Design a protein around this ligand. Sequence first.
Ligand SMILES: NS(=O)(=O)c1ccc(C(=O)NCc2c(F)cccc2F)cc1
Ligand SMILES: [Hg+2]
Ligand SMILES: [Zn+2]
Length: 258
Amino acid sequence: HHWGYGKHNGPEHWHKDFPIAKGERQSPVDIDTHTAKYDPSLKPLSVSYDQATSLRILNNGHAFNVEFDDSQDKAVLKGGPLDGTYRLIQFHFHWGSLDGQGSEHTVDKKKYAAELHLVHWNTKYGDVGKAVQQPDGLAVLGIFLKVGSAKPGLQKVVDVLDSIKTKGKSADFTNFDPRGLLPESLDYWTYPGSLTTPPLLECVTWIVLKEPISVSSEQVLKFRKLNFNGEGEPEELMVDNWRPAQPLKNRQIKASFK
Ligand SMILES: NS(=O)(=O)c1ccc(C(=O)NCc2c(F)cccc2F)cc1
Ligand SMILES: [Hg+2]
Ligand SMILES: [Zn+2]
């Protein structure tokens, strides 16, 4: 039926409706640190989120997205392996039912508690719909979350989750500063990939940060209390909404650090 992360509609079944699942540049992938090539020609990332305008947070089944006003170059990502300017459109997480799993990308086979994806689209394409039909249409900034000390900048997100417990629910979410979610170092790995959820389009330049941010057990606990189901339907906890690592194939992971 409609795709999900359960036994009968999970990742292993997506190929039946989305053939691209067995494609050449699928994500996520495992990052083998000893095989990633240090590329000194990579520029530093330029994250300009000072004028970010968040608007809403919503539970779309699958996960919760915090949306931003992308009608103007307010919050952008440039530099790194990117050519052109990419506007932030939304951010979401993938997490697990236990602290030992949750991330989509893995580092030397190590899974983290969750992973944050900051989605940006290439402005040269006019709108996100066009951008998804291009090889360099999207840039997703991936940040790993480890369980440890609480992340202050994440608390506003955590407190509003009760308002969007079920699928289809949304809440006004203005004045949120995404800069509060970045680690201190911007060192990263990069490779050409795809969306990790259907349509699974291969239009993404992945930029995965080396340094994870730490969040408290209590903070991660609250993510786990969300529901995949809509109001009135039988409760299905939103946990393990992650796709397992895909084969790297003919791709090379570059690193911006030595
Ligand atoms: N986890 S991840 O790889 O960062 C990621 C990021 C964005 C999207 C998305 O915007 N879906 C929109 C969308 C549709 F729902 C249908 C067709 C095209 C789309 F762009 C999906 C997965
Ligand atoms: Hg594409
Ligand atoms: Zn994601």
